[PDB]
Structures are given as C-alpha cells and as structure tokens.
Amino acid sequence: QECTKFKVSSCRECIESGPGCTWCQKLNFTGPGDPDSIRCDTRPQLLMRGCAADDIMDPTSLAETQQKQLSPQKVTLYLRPGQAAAFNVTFRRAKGYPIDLYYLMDLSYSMLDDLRNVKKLGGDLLRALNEITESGRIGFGSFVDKTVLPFVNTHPDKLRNPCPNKEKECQPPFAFRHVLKLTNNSNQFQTEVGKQLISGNLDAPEGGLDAMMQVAACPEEIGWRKVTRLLVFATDDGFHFAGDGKLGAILTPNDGRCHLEDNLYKRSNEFDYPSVGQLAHKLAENNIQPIFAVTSRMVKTYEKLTEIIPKSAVGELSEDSSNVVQLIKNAYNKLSSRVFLDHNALPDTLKVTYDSFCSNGVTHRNQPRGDCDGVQINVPITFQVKVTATECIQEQSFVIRALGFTDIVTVQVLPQCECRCRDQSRDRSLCHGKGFLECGICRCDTGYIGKNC
Amino acid sequence: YNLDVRGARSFSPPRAGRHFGYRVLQVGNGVIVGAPGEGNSTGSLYQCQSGTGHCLPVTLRGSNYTSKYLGMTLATDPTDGSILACDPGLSRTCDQNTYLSGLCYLFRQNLQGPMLQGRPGFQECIKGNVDLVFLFDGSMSLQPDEFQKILDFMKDVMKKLSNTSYQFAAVQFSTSYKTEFDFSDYVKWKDPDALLKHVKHMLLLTNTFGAINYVATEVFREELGARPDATKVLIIITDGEATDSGNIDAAKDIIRYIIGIGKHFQTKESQETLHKFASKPASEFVKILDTFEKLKDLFTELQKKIQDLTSFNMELSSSGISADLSRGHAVVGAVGAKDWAGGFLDLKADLQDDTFIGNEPLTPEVRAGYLGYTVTWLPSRQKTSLLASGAPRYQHMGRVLLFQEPQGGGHWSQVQTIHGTQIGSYFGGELCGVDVDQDGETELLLIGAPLFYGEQRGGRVFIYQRRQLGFEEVSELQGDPGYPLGRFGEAITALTDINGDGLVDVAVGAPLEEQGAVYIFNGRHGGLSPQPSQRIEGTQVLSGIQWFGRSIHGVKDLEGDGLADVAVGAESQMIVLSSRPVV
Ligand SMILES: *[C@@H]1O[C@H](CO)[C@@H](O)[C@H](O)[C@H]1NC(C)=O
Ligand SMILES: *[C@@H]1O[C@H](CO)[C@@H](O)[C@H](O)[C@H]1NC(C)=O
Ligand SMILES: *[C@@H]1O[C@H](CO)[C@@H](O)[C@H](O)[C@H]1NC(C)=O
Ligand SMILES: [Ca+2]
Ligand SMILES: [Ca+2]
Ligand SMILES: [Ca+2]
Ligand SMILES: [Ca+2]
Ligand SMILES: [Cl-]
Ligand SMILES: [Mg+2]
Ligand SMILES: [Mg+2]
C-alpha cells in the first residue's frame, strides 16, 4: 500500500520500483506540463488522479504448475520484486524400495559378546528387511580406531594383542575393514563375518566416523544399489572427530575421498577424523541414512546427531547386541515417518520458505525447510512453498528435494517486471507520428523530436 | 582494508613439509615457524629472516629428543619477549605400556640464545620389577618414638607390597652408613619385623650426600641381590638438613623420593634444601610432613603412585599440546590427564617444577573432554588475572573453563563454566583474549567453534565480555556464508592496532574456505566490530596455496615500513602482510 519512486519513465521501471507501485495506461492521461511519472503511484493515488480501475497495471507474482510421490515435478514462477508466489507440493508417501543395510560394527574389546551374537544374525537381518519391503541385501564392516599413539598402544606385543592379555583370538587394532559387499546371501554374511576376531585399543572414543566416511565415499566397493540405503552404526561409547587427531600429530584434514586398499583404510593415520558436518554432508549427498545403534548411556549423545544429520535415527542397543533386529525395525519406522522438504543452494536474490501442513495434527509456517512427522504410507501431506525475489532477476532455476529420496521438483524462476498492457489497436494514427504505442505511453522510434512524437 | 595484499611476501624452505606454517610467531626482524613433521619426518622450528627472505631450520642445542610433534606449540610472552616451544611427542615404553607426554623449551632472549628445557607432567617409568631402598635418618635429633615411627613406616610399605615384584633394602645413615639388610636378605625372608630387628639408632649427624652415594655404589649391587632389569627407586626419610655437601651424581639414574619430617622443615627455605636430593619435579618427589604421625597418611600416596593400564593419570598426559605465557608465567595444556579429562600444568620459571590444575570435581562426564586443548591468559591489573582453557570434546560438544590465578596465599580456583551447544562443533577449540581499549584489563574472551555446522556458514567465533559475575556472551564475529565446512574460527589472534586508532584489532583464520581466507575485525568503542573490514583470499597471495589462515600472528613492527606486520601460515607456506594507513 506504499510506493517510493525515483527514476520512473516507463511502466517496467514502475514495477521494478516496488511491489506497491502500479501504472495507469489511460490514453492522454498526462497533462501538457506533467511527466508520465505521475502515471506510476499506489492504487488509491492513481484512482485519486482519475485513472479507472481497469486501466491500473498491477502485476502479481504467479506460479504455473505443470501417481507420483512428489508432485508437481516442474513449476515456473513469475516474480515481481517484493511479492512472493506460492505453490503447493504434495508428498504422498509410496511403498518402500528394497533396502540395502550395511552393518558397521565397533570391534573394540567390550564388543566381544556383541560380536558372537552378530555372527549369527545374517539370516534374521535379511528376513527382517524382507518383512519391511522386497529384495533386501546386507553387508558388514568393522572398525576400532586409528593405529597411532595414544589411540592404540604401539608396543609391538600390544599391537599383536591389543586385547587384555588373557585373550587368545584377537586381531591387531585397525581403522576400518570392509568385510562383506552388499548381498542377499545370508550364508555369505555368516562365513565372512564369522572370520572376524575381536580387537582392542586404548582410549574410549572410537574412530567409527572414519569408517562411516569410507563407507559413504566408496559406493562401488560397498555395493550400494539406487534403493533405500541404511547404515547401522553399532557401538557402546563415544566417537572421535576432527581436531582429535592432533594428539597423534595427525594434522591433515579428512579429504572425504575413498581410500580403501585391500578392503582396509590403510592411510587412516595420514588423515584426521572427519568433522560431524563433513560426514552429514557426505551422507546427504549419497542418500545414506545412518542408524545409530548405541548402548543406553550413549543414546542421548547420539540423538544430538539427528539434529545435524536430518535423515538418521537412534536406537538403544543392548550390552550384547541381541536386540539389534528389533532396533533396526523401530529405526526404519522413525526414519520413514519423517519427511523434510529442502532445496539446494540458492542465490541470495531469492528466498524460499515452507509451510508444512501435516496429517498428524501439526502446522508449521514460514520455515527454511519443510518438516512433517508421523507421515503414513498413502496419506498425503501438503507443503506450501513461497518464493520471493528482491529485484528483477535473470532467468534461473533451483531444485526442491524430499530428503532421503531422489524425486525432485524443478522450479524455474522467471522475472515478471514487464507490464502486460493492451493493444495499440483502435488507437492507431498513433502519436501523430511514426512511433508505436506501448502501455498508453508513446516510445517514439529513436529520434525525430518529442515525447508525443 | 589496511592490510596490503599487493605487497604480501611469502616464505618457504626448499624442503618444507605440508605442516610448515602450522604455527607462526613474529620476533624482531624474523618470523618463527613451527613445522611439525608428516609421515616419518621429525618436526622442526624455522627462523625466517625478514631481510634475506630465507627460512632456516633451528638446531635445538643440548636437546636429546625430537619427535614429529616439534612445531606444534609456539607461544611468546608479550611482557618480556620469552619464547616457549614444546614437543608433545615424547613417547617411551614402560614394560608393555607406552607413555606420551611433552618436552618444552624456553628461549628467554631469542632462538640463538640460552635455552632451558623441562618435561612437564612427566611420569617416570615404574616397572613390574622394582628394587627399592629405604635410606632413613638416624640423627641425634630423633626421639626414640620418632625413630620407631620411621621403622614402622618402612615395615608397612614392605607389608603392603609383600606379594609384588618389589625387592627391598634398608640403610640407616647419620654420620656413617649401615646396610640393615640387602636385597638377598629380603628375598630369603620377606619378613619386615625380622629384617629390621637388629637396627640400632646411631644418634649422630645427618650426612645425606655421602649416604646417597653409598646407596648408589654399595647397595644396588647384583651380587647383593639387585636385579639389573628393575627400576631403581630410593626413598629418603630425614628430620633435618644435611650436615655435609657435594653432589649425588652417582645416583642420578635412581628415582629418588625424599620425606622431610618435623620442626626443622617448618620454613620454606629448609624444605627447599631437600630438592637437590630428590628427582624432578619436586612437587612429586619432595614430601614435607609437619608431624611424625602423618607417616601413616603417606602410605597411599608414596605407594599407590609407586602393567596393562586401562586407566591413565599422567602416563598419556600429552603435556605441551598448547601453551601461553603472560607476565613471566607459563602454562601448558595436558589433554590426556585423567583419562583425557584434561587440565593444564602451571610451570615454574626455570621449567624444573610444575603444578597440575584440572577439572574439579573429577566426574565421569569430564572424561574424554580434552581440557587444556587451548589455554589463554586473560591478564588484568585492577581485577584478578584469569586463565581460560577449552575442553573442545566435553560431552562431544565442548566447553570453556575460567580459572582464577592464586590470590594471596590461595590456590588456583575455577570460577566459571561456558557450555557449547552443538555436538562436534569443537566449541573451545580456539581461544583468544583481547584488551581492545588497552586499559590493562582484558575484557574480551573470544571462543572459536571452528567445526560448527549449519546455515551455510562453517565455524563460529563468539564474543564474551567480563562482567562482575563473569563472562557474558555479547556478540559474534560474522564470517561470510557459502563455505559450510570452511572452519571459520580455527585461528583467532589479536593483531594489536593495525589502523592507528589506538584500539586493538582481531584476525580470524578460515583455512578451509576454498584455499583459505583471513578476516579482519576492527576494534571499536565498547568492543569488537561484528562485521569484517577485510577478507583476504589465499588465492590472491599465492595461486597454488591451501589452508591459508591456519595460523595468524600480529605485532607492531619496529623495522620496516607500515604500522603492523601480520604473519599468516598456510600449507608449506608462511606469508607476511604489512598494515598501512592508506592501502
Ligand atoms: C495449499 O494448501 C493449503 C492447505 O491445504 C491451502 O491453505 C493453500 O491455499 C494452498 N496453497 C495454494 C497456493 O493453493
Ligand atoms: C540376489 O542377488 C543376486 C545377484 O548376485 C541375483 O542374481 C539374485 O536374483 C538375487 N536373489 C536371490 C534369491 O538370489
Ligand atoms: C641429555 O642426555 C645427556 C646424556 O648424553 C645428558 O648428559 C643430559 O643431561 C641430557 N639432557 C637433559 C636436559 O637432561
Ligand atoms: Ca558388550
Ligand atoms: Ca579409541
Ligand atoms: Ca580492556
Ligand atoms: Ca585498530
Ligand atoms: Cl639431627
Ligand atoms: Mg570401545
Ligand atoms: Mg636430625
């Protein structure tokens, strides 16, 4: 309801001046001494000056939308500066894809009883995945920590036997070992995971984030399909991250690249631990959803990660990991009942907010990300997307994802700073000259002399 | 925009490793650069000359050890020009265990001058096999009940250690020395009451030098039952000062505790006289007891302190992983203390003694918190001087503790806790104190959280201001967005005054923003400016550069042209920029 005008000599400069400015298109609307800048003002002020309602040019931001899980797929917006356009994205949660589940396990010494139970769970895990959806695959990998002091005792006897001295079937400490490529054969899991021995190390936080990064950075060795990707992270206390490597004089940052050699992370002592945010980024890119299976005392700590890795869940693991199959089923339900609607990086000439109209009884408005919980299969929820431009922008685009899924909404952003007026037909004989008539003002073909040609 | 990027100079030795530039420090006409080694290389320090443009490796004079860690820790004292360098990679094996602590070097004048060294938080190796000798005072000052209590102390120590690999010997000393039983005499009996039942009180002088030389040459003998594979330990028990003089060089390989008991060690001056007899640090090996009945209370401290470790005190202390000097006082952090709860060591000026200050109380929640990862003095003149230390891993979130200097005859006390909010952000992984108006009161504590994630900004720097009740969060130093993993905050330094307005300015390194960047925040009235006045892309100074801004140091420079010189570390590079009134 307000308009500040500085340079206006055309209808397009009027719209550019602000969202509250409007333009009269009446013919012969201007007096002899007046400019055609009087033709651009707020709606009530124009009406004050004798312009009729139908001659008021007042563009409005518009959205053109063109069985799926994410609809619509393509949207074109027309943004005049300062006014948002709104369109609704519908999320109708479909039936689940097949599930790849890579089981990444702590093998420090307190996990000895857990290891004996997990060695026998290959059958139950596949049967659990096939009770959820169709055609499941399972994999396995293990981790302890970096193999430099003070994370491990580097005394040669304690490298050969990091476990307490009684222990007789113990492997030297290691950073990460890829044991089993994703497979639907449970007997392969049994004989491959059965070959693994318990290990040990020196300090309580472990290097599992090293292993998670190598899992997310080596998709060909791990064997991810383009289906649902779950990464179970099973441990019973804390985790190292970037900055801790300094104690071992490891100062080079993690480069987020694959470094598997002979299914081992050999160069682990050349790189620092990844930062949580670095890992969250890598997991989102590759659509890998971690399931932190942790003991009761660690649950509150690992739950803080779900703050930072949106598609993740935490479940309380027993001291012997005997409940892990029900842990994974519960975690799947929590993972898939939560739906985030996000967009990729934007130019700062644009702003996007989300309204989340959820079926569980909840409504969020004007948020940087859409968020609904309690989403059910075949029960649609609605996200209202609002996009605002601060200026006349160049043609652009950006994509809207549902986190964890590959479906996208491609939003083509187009400026609407042009006025869309009328035909100079019925008015020809024109300006008493050569020039043509646009929007009630004559823009004379360059020269002769005159505004009125 | 007072840093002349067009005039930047760069330094790099021909054999520089990737971590040349991990620390930078400006001393008259030079930059000192810490260069921790990568791979199999050992670390070193480089002295870079402003005139020649060359960097040369520093030869540590009288140093017995250099690990890859050397170069990790460089600090300078603004009040007196001291330089402290630390190598927190002193590793050693004790039976099947490995220990890891620091070696620190103090250059009082310059790197070419005299050097002092010490091992803060050093744990001596006590093996399974221990040959322990009691050397007990029998001087004329001891009343019979006091002499007896000395006898009973040695008995309870032998009794509590009876089923261990320890073997014992005992020597009375006064004017002369008598072996009351050898190691073989302990093996054949293991009865303390029998081994000492022939002991007769000598009732003469106190010849401590000769006694110790006697023990080292006449008691630790293989033909008397001494095992050459065992740790040699000596426990001296005396009630007065030594009546002779000389040296105990013949006993320097022995771990020596000494216990001064009674009225003759009332003064701190007399207690000081026992330090030459014991091992270092005197805070560990010199025990002063005011009464003879406290020989019972000492049973735990001198025996529980005396192999498969699953829980560690100072054996993996990692001392010297950080340092800071103020007003001649040095402290180094020790993140490994108390199962990586952490803490810091208050160093004596000659580096020959230290005092550990840590979390209090030791709760299970401080474990693996890495307190002492950062240590920063916060000196004041009218108000009390403080020390800030970050535990960037506290509960996987981090926190910062404020300690107050000992006031009067008091001790270090912990006066405030500052909590981080985001897991993995490394809240407290970098700290910096700033006295902006230069009134002599350091009012600003800057806390880096360089791993902070979210809102398209990587890393944060928060501004805390000292109020009557403690430090309150007043603002944040805003870095540019668009680098979600850029590690804004990894380096924070006060530059002194670069734009000639009298207010101190701050630099903030962001080493993973593309090839690295440095932000400059000008001091204003009442604090720091939240928006930067300049951002320096590393790509602008050198084209093949990385990690620009990993370390920063600023000083008013006395030679050269410009108001201030700023040194910035990068991967295998060190860059010097001059501050100018008009750029
Ligand atoms: C989107 O749906 C909500 C609720 O169903 C409704 O209030 C709103 O008008 C819709 N938005 C558009 C642009 O149609
Ligand atoms: C399992 O995966 C294999 C690929 O190795 C595929 O050939 C097979 O059809 C799948 N199903 C069964 C039951 O083996
Ligand atoms: C270094 O070792 C030598 C032995 O060759 C010794 O004389 C010297 O005192 C040692 N240095 C320190 C600082 O103890
Ligand atoms: Ca267990
Ligand atoms: Ca560990
Ligand atoms: Ca001040
Ligand atoms: Ca200034
Ligand atoms: Cl005496
Ligand atoms: Mg463990
Ligand atoms: Mg005496």
CATH for A73: 2.60.40.1510
Q: How many whole angstroms separate alpha carbon A306 and alpha carbon A421?
A: 52
User: Three-state SS for B202?
Assistant: coil
**CB-ligand 1 contact for A359 (6 Å cutoff):** no
Is B77 annotated for ligand binding?
no
Same domain, B114 and B135: no
Determine the structural domain holding residue B536 and report its residue range.
1-126+308-583
**B521 within 8 A of B505, measured Cβ to Cβ:** yes
Query: Which DSSP letter does residue B502 get?
Result: S
Same domain, B269 and B315: no
Q: Is A153–B98 a contact, with Cβ atoms under 8 angstroms apart? A: yes
Whether a cis peptide bond, with omega within 30° of 0, leads into B361 is yes
| Type of residue numbered A361 | G
Is A114 annotated for ligand binding?
yes
User: Three-state SS for A340?
Assistant: strand
CA dihedral A73, A76, A80, A83 (to 10 degrees): -20
Same domain, B460 and B517: yes
- What Rg value do the Cα atoms of chain A yield, rounded? 31
Of all ligands present, the nearest one to the C-alpha of B261 is 10
Instruction: Give the residue, out of A88, A90, A385, with the most ligand 1 atoms within 8 A of its beta carbon, to mutate for a pocket test.
Output: A88
Same domain, B90 and B131: no
Same domain, B237 and B371: no
**Helical (H) or strand (E) element with B185:** helix B183-187
Q: Cα B260 to chain center, whole Å? A: 28
Q: What is the DSSP string of A412-433?
A: EEEE---------TT-TTTTSS
Instruction: Report the candidate in A292, A321, A306 with the shortest Cα–Cα distance to residue A233.
Output: A292
Same domain, A440 and A409: yes
Task: Classify residue A95 as exposed, middle or buried by CB count within 10 Å of its CB (0-12, 13-18, 19+).
Answer: exposed
**Helical (H) or strand (E) element with B212:** helix B208-218
Q: How many whole angstroms separate alpha carbon A35 and alpha carbon A299?
A: 71
Same domain, A13 and A162: no
Instruction: Report the candidate in A142, A97, A103 with the shortest Cα–Cα distance to residue A122.
Output: A103
**B23 within 8 A of B569, measured Cβ to Cβ:** yes
Q: Which of A339, A365, A386 is the last residue of a domain?
A: A339
Cα angle B97, B102, B103; round to 5? 125
Instruction: Report the candidate in B431, B451, B554, B577 with the shortest Cα–Cα distance to residue B491.
Output: B431
Instruction: Report the candidate in B200, B282, B213 with the shortest Cα–Cα distance to residue B242.
Output: B213
Q: Which of A305, A339, A373 is the last residue of a domain?
A: A339
Is A270 annotated for ligand binding?
no
CA dihedral B524, B527, B530, B534 (to 10 degrees): 40
Whether a cis peptide bond, with omega within 30° of 0, leads into B78 is no
Same domain, B437 and B568: yes
Q: Which of B307, B339, B372 is the last residue of a domain?
A: B307
Buried b (16+ CB within 10 A) or exposed e, B194-210: ebbeebebbeebbbbbb
Beta-carbon contacts of residue B522 (< 8 Å; ≥ 6 apart): B498, B499, B501, B503, B505, B528, B529, B533
Same domain, A420 and A309: no
**B257 within 8 A of B285, measured Cβ to Cβ:** yes
Q: How many whole angstroms separate alpha carbon B237 and alpha carbon B154?
A: 10
Instruction: Report the candidate in B62, B55, B576, B117 with the shortest Cα–Cα distance to residue B45.
Output: B55
**B368 within 8 A of B339, measured Cβ to Cβ:** yes
Residue with tokens 């397009």: A12
Lining residues, ligand 3, CB within 6 Å:
B 64, 117
Give the number of residues written for chain B.
583
Q: How many whole angstroms separate alpha carbon A47 and alpha carbon A32?
A: 20
User: Within 10 A of A398 (CB to CB), how many other CB atoms are there?
Assistant: 17
**A175 within 8 A of A181, measured Cβ to Cβ:** no
Same domain, A98 and A41: no
**Cβ-based interface (< 8 Å): residues of A facing B:** 149-150, 153-155, 157-158, 164-165, 202-205, 238-239, 241-244, 246-247, 249, 251-253, 270, 275-278, 280-281, 301, 304-305, 307-308, 345
Buried b (16+ CB within 10 A) or exposed e, A35-56: ebbbbbbbbeebeeeebeeebb
Same domain, A103 and A57: no
Same domain, B297 and B318: no
Q: How many whole angstroms separate alpha carbon B2 and alpha carbon A48?
A: 55
Q: What's the farthest any 2 CA atoms get from each other in chain A?
A: 108
B37: chain A residues, CB-CB within 8 Å:
249
Same domain, A122 and A252: yes
Of all ligands present, the nearest one to the C-alpha of A199 is 9
Token couple for A207: 């290097």
Token couple for A354: 């989300």
Q: How many whole angstroms separate alpha carbon B4 and alpha carbon B579?
A: 6
Query: Which DSSP letter does residue A445 get?
Result: S
**How are beta strands A74-79 and A70-71 bridged, if at all?**
unpaired
The CATH number for A147's domain is 3.40.50.410
Same domain, A289 and A141: yes
User: Three-state SS for A150?
Assistant: coil
The number of folded domains in chain A is: 3
Separation of first and last alpha carbons in chain B: 7
Q: Is A281–B72 a contact, with Cβ atoms under 8 angstroms apart? A: no
Phi, psi of B154 (to 5 degrees): -60, -35
**B422 within 8 A of B403, measured Cβ to Cβ:** no
Q: How was this structure determined?
A: X-ray
Is B290 annotated for ligand binding?
no
CA dihedral B480, B481, B483, B484 (to 10 degrees): 130
Strands ordered across the beta sheet of A363-367: A70-71, A85-91, A381-389, A350-357, A363-367
Same domain, A20 and A67: no
Same domain, A79 and A136: no
Residue with tokens 């690295």: B516
Same domain, A82 and A107: no
Q: Cα B64 to chain center, whole Å? A: 18
Strands ordered across the beta sheet of B343-347: B319-326, B329-334, B343-347, B354-358
Q: How many whole angstroms separate alpha carbon A429 and alpha carbon A403?
A: 60
Same domain, B140 and B70: no
Task: Classify residue B454 as exposed, middle or buried by CB count within 10 Å of its CB (0-12, 13-18, 19+).
Answer: middle
Q: How far is CA A394 from CA A279, A345, A353, A412, B31, in A?
A: 34, 16, 21, 11, 49
**B561 within 8 A of B578, measured Cβ to Cβ:** yes
| Distance of CA A122 from the midpoint of ligand 4 (Å) | 19
Of all ligands present, the nearest one to the C-alpha of A126 is 2
Q: Which of B245, B277, B307 is the last residue of a domain?
A: B307
Same domain, B207 and B274: yes
Task: Classify residue A420 as exposed, middle or buried by CB count within 10 Å of its CB (0-12, 13-18, 19+).
Answer: exposed
Same domain, B417 and B538: yes
Print the SS3 string covering B341-404: CEEEEEECCCCCCEEEEECCCCCCCCCCCCECCEEEEECECCCCCEEEEEECCHHHCCEEEEEE
| Type of residue numbered A311 | K
Q: How many whole angstroms separate alpha carbon B493 and alpha carbon B321?
A: 18
Task: Classify residue A424 as exposed, middle or buried by CB count within 10 Å of its CB (0-12, 13-18, 19+).
Answer: middle
User: Within 10 A of B137 (CB to CB), how many other CB atoms are there?
Assistant: 25
Q: How many whole angstroms separate alpha carbon B386 and alpha carbon B378?
A: 5
Q: Which of B286, B307, B328 is the last residue of a domain?
A: B307
Q: Which of A293, A322, A339 is the last residue of a domain?
A: A339
| Distance of CA A184 from the midpoint of ligand 2 (Å) | 6
Q: How many whole angstroms separate alpha carbon B353 and alpha carbon B274?
A: 14
User: Within 10 A of B249 (CB to CB), how many other CB atoms are there?
Assistant: 9
Residue with tokens 């390989």: B253
Same domain, B370 and B253: no
The ligand 3 atom at the shortest distance from the C-alpha of residue B64 is: 1
Same domain, B534 and B481: yes
Buried b (16+ CB within 10 A) or exposed e, B56-94: eebebeeeeebbbbbbbbbbbbeeeebbbbbbbbbeeeb
- What Rg value do the Cα atoms of chain B yield, rounded? 27
Same domain, A299 and A405: no
Separation of first and last alpha carbons in chain A: 34
Q: How far is CA A335 from CA A12, A300, B344, in A?
A: 49, 17, 43
Task: Classify residue B559 as exposed, middle or buried by CB count within 10 Å of its CB (0-12, 13-18, 19+).
Answer: exposed
Residue with tokens 């998709």: A219
**B464 within 8 A of B471, measured Cβ to Cβ:** yes
**A353 within 8 A of A386, measured Cβ to Cβ:** yes
Instruction: Report the candidate in B496, B498, B501 with the shortest Cα–Cα distance to residue B563.
Output: B498
Which candidate from B19, B321, B395 shows the least CB-CB separation from A247?
A: B321
The number of folded domains in chain B is: 2
**Helical (H) or strand (E) element with A22:** strand A22-24
Instruction: Give the residue, out of A87, A356, A382, with the most ligand 1 atoms within 8 A of its beta carbon, to mutate for a pocket test.
Output: A382
Q: Is B39–A244 a contact, with Cβ atoms under 8 angstroms apart? A: no
Count H helices and E strands in chain A, helices first: 11, 24
The CATH number for A28's domain is 3.30.1680.10
Query: Which DSSP letter does residue B275 get?
Result: G
Phi, psi of B522 (to 5 degrees): -80, 145
Q: How many whole angstroms separate alpha carbon A59 and alpha carbon A80?
A: 7
Token couple for A274: 């990844």
The CATH number for B216's domain is 3.40.50.410
Q: What is the DSSP string of A57-116?
A: E----EEEE---SEE-SEEEEEE-TT--EEEEEEE---PPPPEEEEEEEE-SGGGHHHHH
Determine the structural domain holding residue A406 and report its residue range.
62-93+340-453
Same domain, A290 and A399: no
Instruction: Report the candidate in B553, B495, B540, B534 with the shortest Cα–Cα distance to residue B514.
Output: B540
Q: How many Cβ pairs closer than 8 A exist between chain A and B?
A: 113
| Distance of CA A350 from the midpoint of ligand 2 (Å) | 48
**CB-ligand 1 contact for A337 (6 Å cutoff):** no
Q: Is A241–B484 a contact, with Cβ atoms under 8 angstroms apart? A: no
| Distance of CA B75 from the midpoint of ligand 3 (Å) | 25
Instruction: Give the residue, out of B63, B64, B104, with the most ligand 3 atoms within 8 A of its beta carbon, to mutate for a pocket test.
Output: B64
B454: chain A residues, CB-CB within 8 Å:
277, 308
Q: What are B121's strand-pairing partners? A: none
